[PDB]
């Protein structure tokens, strides 16, 4: 679980890097589809799932808007992310083993873009937070 120290560290990191939310999402999703090709099938209804796609860029803005929502709802991620859990479990049927894949891609992207801010201390609290995000997104699965 997230301590007061973890919550403050996640809020302070997002306060610094959130300006680049859209770019972080485009790059994280781009990486996920290329590096973990099992995930591409979930986006295959889009007209373009190739590198540089405007669909991947548009969806990356939404994904990091879900992360920004999770930072706002950090005191109660289950209730805050319930609708997104229902969407991924029931409407999309995304296998829940994939949440940790996108979380790793998000950490890699933040590391590439914000090497000074993404210290080991920022990383431990953000990783605990993304584990909590994955568990909240897993709420409606079983």
């Amino acid at each position: 679980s997230l301590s007061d120290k973890d919550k403050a560290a996640v809020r302070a990191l997002w306060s610094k890097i959130g300006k680049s939310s859209d770019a972080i999402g485009n790059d994280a999703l781009s990486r996920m589809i290329v590096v973990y090709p099992q995930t591409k099938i979930y986006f295959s209804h889009w007209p373009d799932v190739t590198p540089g796609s405007p669909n991947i860029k548009a969806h990356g803005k939404k994904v990091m808007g879900g992360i920004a929502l999770a930072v706002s709802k950090i005191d109660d991620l289950k209730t805050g992310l319930m609708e997104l859990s229902e969407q991924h479990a029931y409407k999309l049927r995304v296998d829940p083993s994939n949440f940790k894949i996108l979380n790793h891609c998000i950490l890699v992207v933040i590391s590439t873009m914000f090497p000074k801010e993404f210290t080991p201390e920022a990383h431990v609290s953000l990783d605990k937070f993304l584990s909590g995000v994955a568990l909240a997104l897993a709420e409606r699965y079983r």
Partner: protein, 146 residues
């Protein structure tokens, strides 16, 4: 594992430009902070209870450099990685009792530190080849476990 010429070229280029003395200490210290239960194997390395502690310890630095150079044997003959780590796997299992899930944790820290060094040059294709290499080494380090 099967390797494409492009993957071989990417891995070779990464290692040719790697500053081991920078990445190695950073990767191991990052693992000791993010997955702090890994500190119990290096409790004789000196003072460690905090992150400024861990980051600056010269023992941790020298050991992170040794770990990163432990990748060299694999990158120099990627078709034989499984048999290139047998003795290292035996050491970590039987002498050091390192739990095997920990190899993947350190692997991810190595990737995250290289990503911070390379910045936009750490493309998706670069990440894919590097993670495929580290996964092969992690599998080989777990090979002698029972």
């Amino acid at each position: 594992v099967e390797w494409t010429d492009k993957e071989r070229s990417i891995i070779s280029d990464i290692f040719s430009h790697m500053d081991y003395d920078d990445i190695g200490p950073k990767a191991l210290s990052r693992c000791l902070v993010v997955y702090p239960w890994t500190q119990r194997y290096f409790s004789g390395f000196g003072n460690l209870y905090n992150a400024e502690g861990i980051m600056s310890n010269a023992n941790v630095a020298a050991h992170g450099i040794k770990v990163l150079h432990g990748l060299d044997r694999g990158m120099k003959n990627m078709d034989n990685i499984a048999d290139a780590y047998t003795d290292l796997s035996t050491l970590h299992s039987e002498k050091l009792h390192v739990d095997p899930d920990n190899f993947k944790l350190l692997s991810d820290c190595i990737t995250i530190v290289l990503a911070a060094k390379m910045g936009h040059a750490f493309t998706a294709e670069t990440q894919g080849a590097f993670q495929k290499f580290l996964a092969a080494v992690v599998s080989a380090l777990g090979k002698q476990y029972h």
